């Protein structure tokens, strides 16, 4: 019987990874040999060693039947070891907890409180779709008990069952009725959590759960009245978890009703001024109250107080405080949007902050605060941030800029220029999915094509390694070859487009090693469409298509073969299927 | 052309570093550990690392990674040879290759590193020569390094001139799961521990097939090594001219010649394995070993390693000859036999249970390898003719040599 | 070492 | 600590100074910034003890760049030590002078370098050559002004063959960084002198001697034959680097050798045993040997025609070694050893390495495509891998089957039924697209092609651009071939890819397909379902210009990376 | 004695080769 | 609720692990490795808040061993820090001068305390003395 402490000391004494792995394998072999004989005296030590090995990163598949056998045992230590094994190495996808349902049912009616509490905790931690179905009745039976130490466990089990089985919440409607007068803080917190979970799961109980708003307000006022707490009072805040739960319930209760907001308006006003945010608990309580006020139909004074609190917390030098303020501002973007414009300087400064989370929050706030009047002004700031942004934020910044241009672009020409600049500067940071959106936007716009075509031609000849920019340029060329070059049928004066540079660029892109088979297909389609779109360069792309028909790629080879067949046998019918594609939103 | 050769540790700490060219910053060693960790986690780890424009070639040592950072397109083979020479010198000077000796002989280690190479070009590579000029417990450099004979120090005097040779034979057999041997190559090893007085020039002579054909005696048993590599002291000119193995023997144990040719004979030990593995119920090990070697030769310390199941437990061994021990660390059962006479037939019947829960991922089928080693056996049949020991002073030498046959890459593919 | 030190130092 | 060390170093006790030096060396090795104490150790530098002198020189070299100003108080000490009677002291002083990265330090060391250039001691000569090479690398203009090129060139034609090799290596290094003007190339007498001293050179000197011959270009068959004969004994050297250098020199000389003469045949015959010996080297050099074999394989593939058993990957071989062995087997694959290659691939497909399994599958597919005699064997192996019930193995088999169908689909109709029901629920794009293309192109031996394509049409609008294009092509091919059972399927595909498809290329392809269908369905068979020409597989052989350049660069870092020497340096 | 084959005396050259 | 709470040392060794979401063993190991790398590759002025995988990855270690939590974006950020501080205080009170060495030896006790404190990722014992008394009573049972 190797003790857990001895195994830990042996593991710590190993230095090399191979030696530690060998020691773990030897310990697992010894444990398996002991379990194969059906040992029950030193089962706790073997279970502890197996759990330690599993936590270190060792396989524990063979240590599954032993945990199940120890679960149905009678020893308190053996029962605890089995419960720990079921919670740690037992999961819904494991499939070994199916036989544990009988053990849980047998232990659900156990007289000992530790066994019943441990079983309830294990069921809540490892809640399954089928385990809850056969254990829903047992959970509801314990919900009506008067045990303060077991009331919280029953509430947690009911919440876990509701989360795993949303259709089982109908049986908990009468079990939690008349449970707002619990003296114990834990029982009251469990009841509040269960009520909030029921309200969030379905809105049918919102009206039924909204009648207890005066009781919750009275409880919150009574808790606030006693500013000290021998139990649960940490950092000068008594029952911070209870206060947070009450604030969350108030924010989620009556979010679209005036009576609920009016009833809790006085409580929110008292909390917003009777709470000190010097400590972390006070700051969290203030943030929760501000979020509840913003998410509910509160008064103008409450909204002003929440905005002032958010602004004060924004100037706090604490990284956590700054992140909380940024999150609150982002959440209160649509609501109190005009009042959020006063923090434009703070949002801009947060982009240059030395915190990754703070910088991300500032960027999100700036993106969400872009309107139809500050979009033009904020475009330069967004471009500067994207140019000098982190590698993980350059793609996000480019996506946000593109979304702002497509949603609140001041003009098509300005939006087109911004998109072209983003494509040129984004390079490999432009998402491939945004390429279809850019193509659709270009196709929809039929007023700015000559300038856009010229810009695409200029950006294509300089560089071709950018997959999104290259694809956009190829699509633009295929769509507006007739407008990119004017009077290019024969030799003319030296212009930007001579009817031969585009074909050479397309051939280089198709034959260039920097092709992912997607831009090559777009280039081939553009070249095929240019046979009818452009009448200057003719009789030359047919040879390339015929040669390109033997490509290594099956799809590319088939496309080349089809293009060659169309050029050699459907020359008169080439223009019959080269019509412009329809433009739709 | 490595910029600087340094010795790392298992935790990424550099035990000792010595820049040779100065073109690579010493701070690049810190990024070597993250690069190695990323390569290992993605399967792209290689001995020759690449940190931007500077390549950090590292060799997995006993306890530290001998990382030799380089900047230009230096000779990778030359860098590897220099690293191997440095490792050999460290092993000769220090019996242990770990962090205990890295930080215990720094005063002499720095001097040895400085004297070994300068400006990225190694200069001193003889362990005896290095020890004769740099010691951990200084005179002018020895004339042996400057002289042509850098592998035989002059002036050595001994009471008796005795040389102990070792005919090391490595029997490597690559038997696939189908029962056929794919890679069956035997690599010879002629290593002699010469301990005499002076600098005698050994005149190696054996029953070589090429030599017998050249001399007209190509009718008896002659060893035809496909690849023959001479030692550093061995003169390549004589061997290319008329196969004359004439060279000055070194002071101590050294490898003069190492034959390497394919083997077309039957394996010395024929091992057949039977896997009566039930579906999560039990496992059967029908391992039968047949001695294909001569009955007059006994395979001492024969250990036929049979890989058992990874999750197998409670195993029972039912064999006839040889003790069978299951090592959980190795995850296999080795059929260890103290003495294995030729022609012996050992049958074993393993039986062990398996866990009810099936394994989440497969563990593979490692090949079964044996550790048979039968000394005084010459499978190749090559017999040494004579050893021409000539000294300027004139003495009667009494060279000795022993033939040892062992199992090298004798791995049998699992079913 | 750094492991024997208290998590909160109280 | 620091104050106590400074006080100990500023004392007149030799034991205390030695203890302080040892403590400073230990602190520097442990990661302690001891550069602040360099000026204190400057006074305690001229010491009779050689152990303290070496430590002081090492500290100055490691603290020269950090404190260049404080290094000006060591020029006199270096000058005094450069005339020390002990050869070891002179060599250490020469090494320290060249190891000090001081712009103003090497200027005053030119006189000591010139004095030590003509040192009689071979170790002293080697140290002087190394110092001259270091000075030239640090300052080429200073080396040219000092006129050390003439001294380096004359060192080759003198005694001290190890010193001669060191001087030759230094001259090659200087010319390597030189712009090729005023090269140090030698006439055939110089090559003969180097070859004569090659046999007396040490292990390190042999590489330097062989490096010079790598740049020399033979112009006569007799000279090339003599060079090959001289380099032949180098193939029987225990040094892996020396063997690799000799092999590279022989390969370079074979470029001007005549195939009619028997010298080329003898060199090829003697090269195979060298390759076999190198293949059994240490794992660190195994990758280098594999890279060298691959580089020389494209030049003389007939040299290792019979070297196939050694190409098998060992059980204990590393992942890089296994990959190199697989690449060598793929490049050296032939119909003579087709069965052995298939057996190795089948055995290699049972390993637990996903990357190794994928590499083995790719090698098997490449062997099947390159050699059509084993097309049936490759198809059987792919079918067995698919039936093995491995997700990665199944995907690899599907990819191999799709590649073979596009390459050799004339006799690939016997696997459509087997591949029709082959656990097609895999969502891997590489396998899904290959299966869709196979179904579309081979929609003749399967009577439920429309039913199979119905399952893949549920998420055609959101599967992938390439996957959507492949599905549309397969639907179009099925409609062209059998439109009675796919008349509605083609219309549904056109509607999904034309109205619900926002992809530009995909939308254009769908519009083109719809236009072709609505214009002339008969012409769609000759336009869409046309007989494609032979697929031009990408050749894995490097360009002849790069192969010739890579022959000269043997054993360098570029050979392992398979990149040009100028495309990998910074 | 010694494991791996007892040491045996070696000649000087091939006496039958002259 | 808290999706997963794991205690990882500065060197990367994990002293605790408790995930309230059923995930594959390989996926769970990959997630733990990514969390350790993010925490190990983060400075002391990052606010101890990371939005990784849309989860409030809050890292706040008062000693060499650090602690990480993963909660949904539906509650205040300071609540997680307060809960972590309360749990640390309760563990210190239950053990007495809790160190890294005692955590490894008391892995079963730490797991039992965590289970008795928070079940399913939600707070189960708001008070600090009631939970300690319950843990002591359970331990005294045998």
PDB file of N, CA and C in Angstrom, chain A residues 436 550-552 561-562 577, chain D residues 502 504 512 527 534-536:
ATOM      1  N   UNK A 436     -15.162  37.503 -50.264  1.00  0.00           N
ATOM      2  CA  UNK A 436     -16.490  37.498 -50.900  1.00  0.00           C
ATOM      3  C   UNK A 436     -17.319  38.728 -50.579  1.00  0.00           C
ATOM      4  N   UNK A 550      -3.744  20.899 -68.373  1.00  0.00           N
ATOM      5  CA  UNK A 550      -3.065  19.734 -67.820  1.00  0.00           C
ATOM      6  C   UNK A 550      -2.454  20.012 -66.451  1.00  0.00           C
ATOM      7  N   UNK A 551      -3.117  20.831 -65.639  1.00  0.00           N
ATOM      8  CA  UNK A 551      -2.593  21.181 -64.329  1.00  0.00           C
ATOM      9  C   UNK A 551      -2.655  19.982 -63.387  1.00  0.00           C
ATOM     10  N   UNK A 552      -1.812  20.028 -62.353  1.00  0.00           N
ATOM     11  CA  UNK A 552      -1.763  18.942 -61.378  1.00  0.00           C
ATOM     12  C   UNK A 552      -3.081  18.835 -60.621  1.00  0.00           C
ATOM     13  N   UNK A 561      -9.341  22.477 -69.007  1.00  0.00           N
ATOM     14  CA  UNK A 561      -9.862  21.688 -70.120  1.00  0.00           C
ATOM     15  C   UNK A 561     -11.172  22.276 -70.628  1.00  0.00           C
ATOM     16  N   UNK A 562     -12.057  22.676 -69.711  1.00  0.00           N
ATOM     17  CA  UNK A 562     -13.321  23.283 -70.115  1.00  0.00           C
ATOM     18  C   UNK A 562     -13.094  24.598 -70.849  1.00  0.00           C
ATOM     19  N   UNK A 577     -22.423  33.227 -72.765  1.00  0.00           N
ATOM     20  CA  UNK A 577     -22.433  32.857 -71.355  1.00  0.00           C
ATOM     21  C   UNK A 577     -21.482  33.713 -70.526  1.00  0.00           C
TER      22      UNK A 577
ATOM     23  N   UNK D 502     -22.566  33.482 -52.368  1.00  0.00           N
ATOM     24  CA  UNK D 502     -21.997  34.817 -52.476  1.00  0.00           C
ATOM     25  C   UNK D 502     -20.532  34.812 -52.890  1.00  0.00           C
ATOM     26  N   UNK D 504     -17.442  35.031 -55.205  1.00  0.00           N
ATOM     27  CA  UNK D 504     -17.291  35.575 -56.567  1.00  0.00           C
ATOM     28  C   UNK D 504     -16.913  34.528 -57.599  1.00  0.00           C
ATOM     29  N   UNK D 512     -21.830  30.436 -65.207  1.00  0.00           N
ATOM     30  CA  UNK D 512     -21.350  29.854 -66.458  1.00  0.00           C
ATOM     31  C   UNK D 512     -21.987  28.491 -66.696  1.00  0.00           C
ATOM     32  N   UNK D 527     -18.196  20.129 -73.938  1.00  0.00           N
ATOM     33  CA  UNK D 527     -17.534  21.284 -73.338  1.00  0.00           C
ATOM     34  C   UNK D 527     -17.163  21.029 -71.883  1.00  0.00           C
ATOM     35  N   UNK D 534      -3.303  14.440 -70.786  1.00  0.00           N
ATOM     36  CA  UNK D 534      -2.484  13.840 -69.743  1.00  0.00           C
ATOM     37  C   UNK D 534      -2.086  14.893 -68.716  1.00  0.00           C
ATOM     38  N   UNK D 535      -2.190  14.531 -67.442  1.00  0.00           N
ATOM     39  CA  UNK D 535      -1.861  15.450 -66.359  1.00  0.00           C
ATOM     40  C   UNK D 535      -0.347  15.511 -66.210  1.00  0.00           C
ATOM     41  N   UNK D 536       0.204  16.721 -66.273  1.00  0.00           N
ATOM     42  CA  UNK D 536       1.644  16.918 -66.146  1.00  0.00           C
ATOM     43  C   UNK D 536       1.992  17.006 -64.665  1.00  0.00           C
TER      44      UNK D 536
END
